[PDB]
């Protein structure tokens with residue numbers, strides 16, 4: 001109508017979830033989104049669905065299939081001819097997946113009655129929103145509340161400018177049409193290492209340049225050392241304190257200069273991915289505003305209930321503090337929607353799981369052991385290795401471990417971290433119990449189906465107290 | 473002779489864990505076991521390690537990889553030759569898995585310091601146990617407590633007796649050296665369809681002949697139905713209501729007659745698996761009278777705590793009442809050792825997960841829906857398909873669903889049931905919520921990572937409450 005209860009600008013996982021939940025709570029909801037995808041029409045779901053979460057998980061699943069037929073089929077007595085990938089077909093499948101899914105979300109807001117404005121939306125004083133359509137149409141809307149879910153973008157570095165051809169960000173990467181001979185990845189983060197894995201399993205030699213002292217500094221210290229080892233055994237070369245000073249591309253490959261034990265220069269990679277960071281988009285989102293503050297780093301100031309400086313305007317997901325993860329932005333969206341309707345809601349930020357979907361998966365919930373040491377919580381810890389799981393052994397999949405950490409005085413579970421088969425699923429079991437204030441004895445006292453990979457969390461909980469059966 | 477605090481008869485999953493846990497508690501414990509593994513020596517582990525759990529999953533994983541490369545790799549642009557199999561290698565790999573795990577259990581009891589006696593153990597009157605070594609050397613050992621965990625064996629049927637060549641039970645079906653081109657399975661339960669799925673995938677035209685006309689009674693009906701369709705689509709031809717009348721082992725094949733409303737005989741399979749049930753084993757454990765009562769069906773009579781009629785004697789696993797599962801045996805073992813050393817334990821027989829490790833895998837916990845309706849309880853059901861899941865789509869593993877059954881009055885969760893990818897893990901996350909007293913609304917409020925198969929549980933709980941993001 002001319003009025004709305006809530007207008008959400010940006011339809012990413014925070015944004016379109018914000019929207020469906022606000023409509024489900026009976027508010028007249030609008031949704032503004034400007035992104036048109038790969039088949040010419042607007043494509044909802046954001047970075048995650050279109051150039052993110054679903055694109056990289058899909059290519060990681062296809063490039064794992066390749067690598068199993070290649071390395072271990074023989075251990076199963078399975079013989080194949082020479083196995084070969086068709087990279088246009090693989091990318092076509094992925095694109096068919098983002099097509100299905102884009103479409104799904106679109107039916108979901110129509111069935112749910114949200115009104116979707118296709119254009120750019122910017123917040124005016126008095127919480128009116130001006131929507132500018134492709135041609136330059138301008139339309140302002142009235143609403144009672146605004147929810148800014150504008151998300152983020154690739155950090156951009158001076159020594160290596162992307163041109164979406166020889167040098168690329170995470171989007172260019174996901175759409176290559178052939179495996180590159182040599183691929184450099186700048187940034188050893190979650191995105192860096194996933195994309196690095198994908199093409200190295202298909203055939204690229206891959207070097208992952210990282211400037212920081214440490215490998216994966218936010219993952220538990222024992223889980224990360226184990227991951228460094230295994231990812232390097234599959235030929236990701238991760239050079240850990242490299243600063244790149246410049247790049248040059250004579251016509252079709254890029255020579256990078258960097259400093260790490262020497263002042264070195266890598267023979268001109270055929271592809272370079274730039275995966276140094278993501279950062280918040282505030283591009284034309286606000287007028288000299290409905291007084292919305294930005295912080296020194298570019299994030300929209302919100303409080304702990306994602307409410308800005310302007311009553312009724314909230315900002316959620318990637319433009320705001322916290323982990324830049326899809327489930328953080330979505331739960332920020334439903335929590336926010338509920339505060340606008342049937343108030344009683346706050347998000348627990350101390351229990352959002354983090355997953356990298358590599359060979360094996362790395363995942364963790366709660367606090368890491370090194371963080372527990374900096375504000376001296378005496379911890380007890382139990383660990384159980386998938387080499388000791390008869391289930392993982394049957395699946396020919398024995399790498400990694402489960403790590404359970406507990407309070408040494410009346411052992412409430414403080415962290416569950418794991419690198420292994422199904423890391424996402426077992427950490428979610430760790431997380432569901434943490435939510436009910438579990439101890440390791442609760443976990444240990446439970447009936448876990450056999451054989452199941454789950455048994456290795458049951459056994460890491462038995463082990464906090466030193467009474468695991470299949471190890472000691 | 474030597475004098476003990478606990479003597480355990482049988483080293484299957486219940487009894488070898490019972491012996492470890494008594495050792496862990498301070499009791500001089502003795503293990504007795506007479507199974508010789510096909511290699512030569514006494515092999516600990518029982519029906520599950522040697523000839524049940526780990527064998528069937530091991531074959532089930534190689535056959536699905538075969539099944540996958542045949543018709544699945546194409547979808548990712550994987551240009552193979554065309555998938556061939558060497559079954560002699562495929563069983564050799566399972567035989568190593570078993571050798572390594574049997575070896576593992578042996579090193580575990582030794583480390584926990586259990587005395588093993590390789591022989592048959594018979595309980596004599598007045599708590600003393602005799603062990604006969606390989607050659608008739610008798611020994612009577614003294615103890616203040618006894619745990620009989622002797623086991624189960626297959627139900628042999630008169631129309632069709634085993635000879636481990638042409639007519640076989642599940643042990644023999646686990647050791648075939650070639651793929652029968654036509655296979656008959658009598659019994660469409662867990663065992664039956666897992667061994668039929670193994671060889672079907674590898675090429676056997678398989679028929680499952682079932683005496684009841686109710687497919688998978690103890691499994692939630694929505695799920696059993698779904699399961700019957702998806703399994704009939706992979707080529708299992710399951711005939712319900714079929715009784716087999718007679719067997720003609722010729723020299724080539726097994727001609728099997730049967731009546732299924734009409735009396736007919738399906739052609740002459742190359743091999744017949746007799747998979748109708750498993751019965752308890754009590755053979756020579758009674759002296760004349762030990763004092764232990766046997767039950768009318770063959771079991772040993774024990775109370776709710778696995779105590780028999782004879783005060784220092786307990787009986788755990790498949791020789792006793794309950795779902796004949798390895799995790800049920802293990803847990804009763806642990807519980808009996810704890811109340812032996814100081815009564816600090818009790819187990820919940822209402823939350824014991826059960827899984828069929830088929831092609832979608834099938835798991836469930838709590839009450840099935842038909843049982844709830846049958847005893848008049850008011851329920852609300854949230855159901856969520858893997859077809860609408862982000863991760864399943866990327867994995868190309870989209871079949872099936874998650875069903876959360878909660879009580880309509882208190883919103884407490886009654887049963888979790890799922891046919892689909894990682895069913896067993898998703899039910900164990902459900903068993904965990906359920907152990908703590910969850911409402912469907914508690915799980916609906918939790919943060920589940922994106923993308924994840926665990927999210928299909930989240931959205932199922934949210935769907936019990938009418939308000940689930942990605943469907944309705």
Ligand SMILES: Cc1cc2nc3c(=O)[nH]c(=O)nc-3n(C[C@H](O)[C@H](O)[C@H](O)COP(=O)(O)OP(=O)(O)OC[C@H]3O[C@@H](n4cnc5c(N)ncnc54)[C@H](O)[C@@H]3O)c2cc1C
Nearest residue numbers: 010012014033034046047048121150151317318324325326
């Ligand atoms: C390669 C990669 C892999 C990732 N993998 C995962 C993963 O597996 N799991 C995970 O949790 N996270 C992952 N992430 C993070 C994840 O995708 C983001 O955290 C998530 O997308 C945050 O969503 P959002 O709603 O805040 O913003 P976004 O998804 O960025 O969506 C914001 C939307 O608002 C729109 N927009 C912006 N301004 C306007 C405007 N002014 N008017 C109209 N429309 C506008 C944009 O077009 C955009 O579509 C990944 C990210 C990448 C790049």
Ligand SMILES: Cc1cc2nc3c(=O)[nH]c(=O)nc-3n(C[C@H](O)[C@H](O)[C@H](O)COP(=O)(O)OP(=O)(O)OC[C@H]3O[C@@H](n4cnc5c(N)ncnc54)[C@H](O)[C@@H]3O)c2cc1C
Nearest residue numbers: 482484485486505518519520524525593623789790797798
């Ligand atoms: C094909 C198949 C697949 C299965 N899959 C699964 C699965 O996936 N998950 C699951 O939970 N269950 C599974 N089961 C069942 C599992 O094998 C049993 O539930 C489990 O073995 C029962 O343990 P138990 O300790 O009671 O007995 P058992 O494992 O049978 O162990 C009994 C032991 O007692 C010993 N014994 C008997 N008499 C004496 C004697 N007098 N003296 C000394 N020793 C003796 C035997 O040699 C034997 O090793 C499967 C079974 C089959 C047949």
